[PDB]
Every structure is written in C-alpha cells, then in structure tokens.
Amino acid sequence: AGITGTWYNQLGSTFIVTAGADGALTGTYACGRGNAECRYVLTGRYDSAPATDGSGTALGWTVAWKNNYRNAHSATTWSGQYVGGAEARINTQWLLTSGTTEANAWKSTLVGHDTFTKVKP
Amino acid sequence: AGITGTWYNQLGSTFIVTAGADGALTGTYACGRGNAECRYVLTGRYDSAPATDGSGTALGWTVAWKNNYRNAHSATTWSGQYVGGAEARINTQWLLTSGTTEANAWKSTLVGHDTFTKVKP
C-alpha cells in the first residue's frame, strides 16, 4: 500500500509501521534519537482498498505514552491520509489527551498537525 | 437573529453578545461569578442571512485572555452554530492557543467543546 516502512515528521520523530493486508497498522513511534527509552507501541487502521481516482488513503493510529521506562499518562491519535508518488507523504492532525481530574479536564487535550515523509527533515 | 443576549455554558461561564444587523458579534465573556476581574472582550461574526430549511446559523468569536487585571497570554476561538426553538442552543468547538517559544509550540493549543444555553446549568 506504500504505507509500510519508516516515516519522519518535521521535528524528526519517526515511526515504523507495517500495513497489513487486512487494514491493520502496527509498529513503533520513536524520538529521532531512537533509543529504547523513547520507543512506544503504535496500533491503528487504514483503508486497504482506497479509491484509484488520485485520492489519498485514509488512516489513523494511536500511541499510549507508556513503555518500560516512562509513563506520561497520555495518548495521541493521528488522523490523516497517505498520498503516494515520488514525494509520498502522510498528512495528519493529532489529538494528545492526558488523564486529568475532572477539574483539569479543560486542559486535557492538545491539538496539532504532522506531515510525515519518507526522508528526514 | 435570536443570538443577541446572555448565554451560559455547562461550566456556568457566561457571555453576553450583541448580534449586529450586518453580521457583527460584540460583547463580553465572563466567569459565572461575573466580577470585573473575570470579564473579557469578545468579538466575532455570524451568518446574518441563514438558511430557512431548519439549519443552524454559523458563527464564531474570539476572546484574548487580557483585561485590566490579568493577562493569560492566550486566546480562545469558538466555532459553531446557533440552533433556535424553545430550547435554543449554541453548539461549539473551541481552540485555546497560548503564546509559546518555538520549543513549546507543541503544547500551544488546547481543544474542547461548549454547549451554550439561555438558562444556567
């Protein structure tokens, strides 16, 4: 599907993903340094039979920010689409939610965007 | 337009707005206590000739969180629609952005939603 492989955002974070025949996404999200301490599990889904009209391929994934080294009590979803071609990209918007008390719910969820490319920034 | 007047969110914050003939929104956003220290200017726009098919009326507004008492170096936009009837409401999603250094841009913008009614929670 052209999705499988290593992707880099413009801050130089990386994730590696396997797109399954079935529509499964599985892999790992890491800081650009790539040490164990900054790797986290990533699971999601994608449209495994996209349009052939030049549309992108819709996907999303989640990372819970807990590994064997660290727990940020939070989780980020990226929602977006894969766009193929000589300059493939994955264009995304994300929601980072932290666990809060009900008082602090107002500040629970950050929003932002990421463009992933096959080559580093 | 049924928009002019006092609205209350489910946390009991309030804003008072005047909808102008021209599409202008002007007024004040306050904490439920309503003291001067928690009042802020609000300006926005609305669709002054909405559909008559039972659609809502689109609007939005901004509050910069600076008054004579306080500066939170931040600003919130509410984007949504006004829905008339015996139980009028304004259904909204909001973006709260704080001024940050470029390092801290990731945490610059919170997202959430508000339902405003004519009666308090």
Partner: peptide, 7 residues
C-alpha cells in the same frame, strides 16, 4: 516536555 516531542 513530553515524549511525542523529545529529541
């Protein structure tokens, strides 16, 4: 800081 953005 947060691991989504740490170097």
């Amino acid at each position: 800081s947060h691991p989504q953005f740490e170097k």
